[PDB]
Design a protein around this ligand. Sequence first.
Ligand SMILES: O=C(O)c1ccc(Nc2ncc3c(n2)-c2ccc(Cl)cc2C(c2c(F)cccc2F)=NC3)cc1
Length: 242
Amino acid sequence: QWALEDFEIGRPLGFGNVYLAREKQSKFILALKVLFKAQLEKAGVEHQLRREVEIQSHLRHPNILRLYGYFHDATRVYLILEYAPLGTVYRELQKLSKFDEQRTATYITELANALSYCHSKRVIHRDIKPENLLLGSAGELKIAGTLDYLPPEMIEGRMHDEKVDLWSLGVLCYEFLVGKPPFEANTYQETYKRISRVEFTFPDFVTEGARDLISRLLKHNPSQRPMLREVLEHPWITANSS
Ligand SMILES: O=C(O)c1ccc(Nc2ncc3c(n2)-c2ccc(Cl)cc2C(c2c(F)cccc2F)=NC3)cc1
């Protein structure tokens, strides 16, 4: 059982705010997520958070952000999270516009690993996107509305499985190389039609090796999408990863 008295709150990092924090006894640096019990009870997704924390703190992977613990105060609910010093992949993306193939392949590899571990633990993520991707001190990737990353089977409300994260991995591979998601539009409506029709095009600079992998991942039929092992063994990933 923790308390707010154990932590020294630092700079803001972000239904509330995420702060830099230092545990007093150990001097351990962490991110402390602050959420108000008012918004959580007004949305009723406190059970969704009860289950989410049950899952997040039970998993151990170098590419999944760690949740150490949690606790609630008078009106707040606190999440003791890992701290990823180099920030979000979303900030890196807009600070560099696009990623080269070697950076893309490594992230994709680290993702495929983190997902293959999740899929072996019967967990399907559904929602990877740059703003949910964080960077550790070594620069390694870490996994912590808008339709851009959702598969056709999901937005159409059909039954879905592990192949959902394969679609997302395709969308992320495209975005890394291009700077924008393959189905981006100015409205939720247009984006919906573009995803369901699976209509995307490649800019000239995108190599055929990348085009192939993305085109394999972005199949409408979930069954035709490669397994994560095939992703990690793709010639384009092979040639460019770390
Ligand atoms: O720009 C900088 O200087 C910067 C920014 C971030 C970090 N590192 C860091 N480390 C851990 C966390 C966060 N950020 C963080 C920060 C803010 C918010 Cl709104 C959410 C989180 C999250 C998060 C989460 F809970 C769900 C989904 C995605 C998340 F990103 N998780 C803890 C370092 C430097």
